[PDB]
Amino acid sequence: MAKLLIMSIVSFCFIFLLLLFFRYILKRYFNYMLNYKVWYLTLLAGLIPFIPIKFIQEFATDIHKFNWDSIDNICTVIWIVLVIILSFKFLKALLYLKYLKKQSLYLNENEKNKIDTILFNHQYKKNIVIRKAETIQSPITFWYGKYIILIPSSYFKSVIDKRLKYIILHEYAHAKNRDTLHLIIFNIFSIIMSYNPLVHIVKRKIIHDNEVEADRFVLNNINKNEFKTYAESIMDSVLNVPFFNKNILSHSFNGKKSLLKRRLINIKEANLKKQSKLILIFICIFTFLLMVIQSQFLMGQSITDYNYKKPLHNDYQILDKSKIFGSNSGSFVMYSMKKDKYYIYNEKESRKRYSPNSTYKIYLAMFGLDRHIINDENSRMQDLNTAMQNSVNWYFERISDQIPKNYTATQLKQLNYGNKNLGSYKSYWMEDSLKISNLEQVIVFKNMMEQNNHFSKKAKNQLSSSLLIKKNEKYELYGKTGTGIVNGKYNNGWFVGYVITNHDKYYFATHLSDGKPSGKNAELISEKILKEMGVLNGQ
Amino acid sequence: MAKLLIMSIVSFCFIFLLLLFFRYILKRYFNYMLNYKVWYLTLLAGLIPFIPIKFIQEFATDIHKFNWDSIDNICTVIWIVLVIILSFKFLKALLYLKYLKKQSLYLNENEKNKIDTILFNHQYKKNIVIRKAETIQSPITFWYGKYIILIPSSYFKSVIDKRLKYIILHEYAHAKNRDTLHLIIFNIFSIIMSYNPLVHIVKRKIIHDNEVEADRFVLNNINKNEFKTYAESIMDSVLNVPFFNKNILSHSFNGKKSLLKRRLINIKEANLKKQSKLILIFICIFTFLLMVIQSQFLMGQSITDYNYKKPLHNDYQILDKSKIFGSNSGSFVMYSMKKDKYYIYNEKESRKRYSPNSTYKIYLAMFGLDRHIINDENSRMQDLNTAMQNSVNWYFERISDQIPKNYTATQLKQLNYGNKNLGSYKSYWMEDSLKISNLEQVIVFKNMMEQNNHFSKKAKNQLSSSLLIKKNEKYELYGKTGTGIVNGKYNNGWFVGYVITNHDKYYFATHLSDGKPSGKNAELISEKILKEMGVLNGQ
Ligand SMILES: [Zn+2]
Ligand SMILES: [Zn+2]
């Protein structure tokens, strides 16, 4: 819903940019100005989309959706608060001004005579008011619905200032365009649309254009011979006093906060003071320590995605089985327990860690078996053999939920199970946090049964039983298949297990990364290779 | 991975803010400056996290994850491009400067004598160079590894300028702090870290502090009686020429782009030109039309979430069944075909549209039946009765996939099926786009069989068969149950159907919004109410 503000922002910026485009060109090539009132069109643009112009068993499913509603609830409140704050600021200036008004004085006759001498050539609509003051240092103007020009008494006391003629024309020019009226109106709208900062940008740009037009007016009424004189009188405006800006709703003559002005102030100021070295020393020390503190927690880099970079403790043989894989790009690893040697296809791919998917069920079962979640006489949660054999997640998810995460972690760590990351979900092995390479599963499965003596003996073979694929006179082939599928595409096909033969004990894993990397294909591929390698021939 | 830049930004802004904090205070209360070199600490802070300081059947599942990797791929390229652009800009200025250097002239004797007269009181390390120029309008300085002060020949021609003493001290002061060295260094770092705009903010702030210190130095060497004179000589710097800023890598004396300066230029410029009205007229016209154009597509508001706001065409009776619902907050609607009257519990809740979930299977079956996706002799995709009866989504998802979306839409529209929105997914009825209220399902189911004669007769009763819950001597109760569950919480329990009795024909729906809003509960609740209402009593 807050997206509506976003839509409004886009509209605003569109119109905003178009106007800026023209402004540049017209000035750049023709020295032309725009009637700034066009900026009201942007405020209007900002409210386009904002206006609603439309012109028997139970079945259930557990869904996940992005909750962006809590965001809008919060954003709504923020918008409200910003408006409240801004209202105050507006008011602050406004109040000052009404109090200021009350302190003004009627202008007397001789001064009036001088003023008329200055403006009689306009014969204007004398529905504006000119007053003097014993307070303010320099002339100002504001609206009140009265259109007031207020001049410090010092400039009448300066009976022969001459320059009065210039300041008067300047003030006249602003009054003429009711700048002080539009400013208020504009600001009110801006206050409400607190969510779009471009409004402040426009607010500010307008002011420069206003002053430029005032200068042109004034010059139009000045004998050019005196333009220099005039310019000098302008410079004088920043030499005597600090600039002031409390009354954001009004117009002053001393120009604005600027580098030049700050410097001029600094020259006048008796600034010849010194400070102890400690000021910088300590700021620097603490700043440093604070960086140190941040560091204690902050770190990151792509290196955290590292796969099985580690060398084997023994010998391995490279093998090519690409005619077998065909389009099913992948890797293959086999290990001989008697030779203490690995046989590897695509040694680069074999090191890449992928979620184990269904082949994690192998380890999951070992863990469930040791913890008596499931056991060798009764493995029911469905049972182990059935669930492994018929692809039942209901069962394995239940085993996982009931294995203390620390037990799982203990064994994932003892066996070097890839990144040993079990995440937080009961289904952590499927396109999720726990990842392992094809080479690692061969290493890991082997250790699970042959080197790691923590596991009960029964857990080791109860698991093998659930994995039997085939048995014959030469060997018994065990393993599990499955596939990680993301957005309907099969991306991670696995077949993991072991072969005990009449000649040796083998561990293996097959992984498919592309083409049609199904579990079934990983199995078929593994079998063809294992047969070619003698594993499934009894050779 | 790009998140790393984000981490860097946070670090940067932390240190940045701390420094700004102190700067304000030290100046505000003690009038103290900082050795700006501390800003290098922020550049260092910006690289904290950046440094990698780490100190048997196949089972498969179809997963969805957020792809933020394409984003990083793109962001990487953008970063590279920004650096390329900035490199050019840097170079542009740099080249200008080397060419400029070559045009400088050695300073002669009398001028040297004057210069030494000015600086003999420093007896400085004369390893810097002073030259004059016949090109530039005002004195400048730069680095080159030479530390050069270059003064236009006009200021030596102005043999009695006097003010030379001031300009020289100013230049000396910048040379002293090697401002021109640090600027380059800083900028180079900034160019690489193109992703964090705060670097530009720092770049700019530094310059003001540099100029302030230069002024202090200069004043320290001036008889205070002349401070006024000095200040006047500063103002003169912006009266004669335009300011220039091509050489961003260097320091000039005419101050900077500013409102005052633009105005002074405008005074000198013969700007008394006029323009045709058409300039604004057409910009305004087109701007308007463009807003019109945007509008043709842009609209939004919360009103699009409207539920079943519409009154019935007949009479309805309010009923309270809150003792039945108990904690299972919900609604209940029943309709009498003979009386043409509705009986409603929680008439507000009954109008709220929710995804129909499994009860959509009712309509889905009608559609599948008419289209011969499934039929009355063979409804297999599992069959209709089984799938309805045993909660099989596999089956219904297949029916949905095979119903032309326009056919479904035709009937959703003829029956006023809530918002009639079937989205885009084969499972659009489950915690998804198609939504309908409890009151609407009663209306809609009724029309499906009693008013809408598009549907085949066989589709109407083939569906009823799959829905039979109970049959007896007084009535046959039909319907379907199910639940929308989100993030494990049951949020939308439904029971929808009809009762044909020995006295009348009833349509009904029960919906549960909170507590334990299961499908089963909606059924139990409906049955208790329907019995109390006489529907399931044959009364
Ligand atoms: Zn003004
Ligand atoms: Zn300077």
Numbering used by the authors:
A (entry chain B), B (entry chain A): 1 to 55, 87 to 412, 428 to 585
The authors write:
BlaR1 and MecR1 are membrane proteins with an N-terminal zinc metalloprotease domain and a C-terminal extracellular β-lactam-binding sensor domain. β-Lactam binding to the extracellular BlaR1 sensor domain regulates BlaI cleavage by the zinc metalloprotease domain in the cytoplasm. BlaR1 forms a domain-swapped dimer, with the zinc metalloprotease active site accessible from the cytoplasm. BlaR1 undergoes spontaneous autocleavage in cis between Ser283 and Phe284 and we describe the catalytic mechanism and specificity underlying the self and BlaI cleavage.
BlaR1 was consistently observed in a dimeric form with two-fold symmetry averaging applied in the overall reconstructions for each sample. More structural heterogeneity was detected in the BlaR1(WT) dataset compared with the uncleavable mutant BlaR1(F284A), suggesting enhanced dynamic motions. In the BlaR1(WT) dataset, the sensor domains were observed to be dynamic and are able to adopt different orientations with respect to each other and the transmembrane domains. A comparison with BlaR1(F284A) shows that the sensor domains are positioned at different distances to the transmembrane domain in order of BlaR1(WT), BlaR1(F284A) and BlaR1(F284A)–ampicillin. Although a range of states exists in all of the samples, the equilibrium is shifted—BlaR1(WT) is dominated by a more extended conformation and the BlaR1(F284A)–ampicillin structure is more compact, with the sensor directly in contact with the outer leaflet of the membrane. In the BlaR1(F284A) mutant structures, the autocleavage loop is intact; however, in the BlaR1(WT) structure, we detected a mixture of uncleaved and cleaved forms, the latter with the central P1′ Phe284 slightly shifted in position. Here, BlaR1(WT) undergoes spontaneous autocleavage, consistent with previous reports. In all of the structures, the protease domain is in an autoinhibited state with the autocleavage loop (both cleaved and uncleaved) occupying the active site, suggesting an equilibrium between active site occupied/autoinhibited and active site accessible states.
